[PDB]
Design a protein around this nucleic acid. Sequence first.
RNA 1: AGCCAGGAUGUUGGCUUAGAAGCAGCCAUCAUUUAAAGAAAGCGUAAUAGCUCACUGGUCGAGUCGGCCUGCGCGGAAGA
Lengths: 132, 176, 163, 141, 38
Amino acid sequence: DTPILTFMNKLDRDIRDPMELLDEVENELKIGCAPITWPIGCGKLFKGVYHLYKDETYLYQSGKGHTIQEVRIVKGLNNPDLDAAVGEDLAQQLRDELELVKGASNEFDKELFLAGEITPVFFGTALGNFGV
Amino acid sequence: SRVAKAPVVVPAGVDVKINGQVITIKGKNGELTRTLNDAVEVKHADNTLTFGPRDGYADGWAQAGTARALLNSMVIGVTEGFTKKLQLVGVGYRAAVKGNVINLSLGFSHPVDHQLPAGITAECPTQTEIVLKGADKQVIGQVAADLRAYRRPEPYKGKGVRYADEVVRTKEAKKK
Amino acid sequence: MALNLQDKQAIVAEVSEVAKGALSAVVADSRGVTVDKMTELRKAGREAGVYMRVVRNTLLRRAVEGTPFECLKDAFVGPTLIAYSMEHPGAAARLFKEFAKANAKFEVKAAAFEGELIPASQIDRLATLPTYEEAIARLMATMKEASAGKLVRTLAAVRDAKE
Amino acid sequence: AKKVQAYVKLQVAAGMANPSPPVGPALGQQGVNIMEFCKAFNAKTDSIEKGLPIPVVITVYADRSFTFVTKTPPAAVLLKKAAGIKSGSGKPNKDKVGKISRAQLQEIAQTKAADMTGADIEAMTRSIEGTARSMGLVVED
Amino acid sequence: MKVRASVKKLCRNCKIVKRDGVIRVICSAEPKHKQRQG
RNA sequence: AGCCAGGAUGUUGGCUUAGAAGCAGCCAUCAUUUAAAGAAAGCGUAAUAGCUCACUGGUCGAGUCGGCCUGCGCGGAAGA
Ligand SMILES: [Mg+2]
Ligand SMILES: [Mg+2]
Ligand SMILES: [Mg+2]
Ligand SMILES: [Mg+2]
Ligand SMILES: [Mg+2]
Ligand SMILES: [Mg+2]
Ligand SMILES: [Mg+2]
Ligand SMILES: [Mg+2]
Ligand SMILES: [Mg+2]
Ligand SMILES: [Mg+2]
Ligand SMILES: [Mg+2]
């Protein structure tokens, strides 16, 4: 009955739909998904992750994987600086996906996590040292 | 011959302004449009346009049929307008439009920003579809070509800018 | 194929299927599948057989110039695409319904069933013929006369009269 | 009837149902369970007799297992138990090997009453006629 | 493409056109059938 | 010529067949379902394949097809 944290590695790479990634984790691993962060773009378009519970956006910088990059936050989820820093196009897809996410996922519950029934899912990149 | 010997029927609405060897058609939409001809003689009259050769020209007919078709597509040009549509394929692609200049992301180290020409506009109903209407058939066809060009469809996975009328062969890599 | 000779042939035969014919159905067939043949020929296994044909001969110029076997009002019955259905043996009944319930399942358009020969005229699918050898519809038709039409009105007050 | 959705046919004989070496992970890999291919089969297989080849549709949706509507066997294998040789062709038309007649193969064409494209009970005769000539069998009609 | 001195259509989807002063084969199915100098 | 349709069933044919259910294979190519449909054209399959071709119907509505005898041209054709 050991608890599981989930880390979605390799956001530097062109990946699958993180929605679909949640299905594969719930369906095939028989365990609930509770997103904590959410990727904004992937591959050449990875811009960072929006934290769902802190409501802010940590901005990914390319190739600082050897040390820890400068923590660069954009506060609001509708902050027009998220549009400026990420492009308003990608910024809306963040907003859209987040809508769908809330209707098909889970709030992180500490009790169910310790019971091994939901996993806190973090999206990141261990190579870029971002999300760790 | 044939296509040439066919009618053209100027739909009630188009101006049809035949000034010697210069035909200008305007209607509903479309900034007019006015091309030229040569060995073909065109004749208005009634509710149509007739196209025929012209003694002394062996180009005749052939030049006349292309006249027809052209002129033909010019009517319809300002009438119904003209089609388009391209879809992007492959993770991390997607297009924008933000005025009359389309912004493209295609896995280079830079966006592309292609700027639409005169009488032709386009929208991105989806991150991954460009639909561009216009009057000048000869021009949409171009801007399509020109766009698709930034990243023609590779024949292994299919990534790149397709039309929809696409066919994408796609084949397997050499055995091991 | 062949020329003028092959022409006449298909007709005289196809049109003798209208002269010596028990029945006649004209069905336009846009999007005609082979399942199509797999049907009127399946409904031929244990309910019909070779007593029926349906040669798509909207050759018109053929099937039509070749109805001097007397098939008037069929110039009107020569529009667009059609698949002539002609009967030789057996009753004229069942064959009609087959298409009636085929095309209504989608199975290609039915040309709104433009109607055909035997009575000789236009369009309006009726059900005269198929009600035969089911004369139990004349058993139920008598409506017991004195009794069934009785226990329905002479005896319907009580179950609906104590208001 | 519709068209395509899921169906195949790869067996050897009803004598040994749901084999492993002959087919195995090849008898079905799309929605068919390799072990569940010995329940709905023998429910009617062992119900009549085993021996003759029996292919069948594989109607598969997404509801766990699968449903196969069986029908008739190959009229070509009916020459190893009800005609002659254990084989078939081998040496086709280089010598008059086997020979059947009009008499035989009659009740063999009669069994397939729901599997014959010929309402004419007589026309559906020359159909299996070839099914006993695809190895070099003369006919003594 | 092939620059043979004899071009020849090979497949059934192979066309044969003259663009500029030069005969070419244009095959829609197979690109190995693409040809110039004919 | 386009464009609209269709292209099955005995028959998953048996077969030197590991497995072969039209197409590396063998030999066979016969008979039905019908307007046409080949155990046969193509892509290419773990094997089914999925999707498309000869051949027939529909639309359109006047020509269209390939050899022959001849005149004149094109490619083939790189050098200090
Ligand atoms: Mg990859
Ligand atoms: Mg004809
Ligand atoms: Mg050039
Ligand atoms: Mg034609
Ligand atoms: Mg076709
Ligand atoms: Mg096989
Ligand atoms: Mg074989
Ligand atoms: Mg094969
Ligand atoms: Mg015929
Ligand atoms: Mg043809
Ligand atoms: Mg010469």
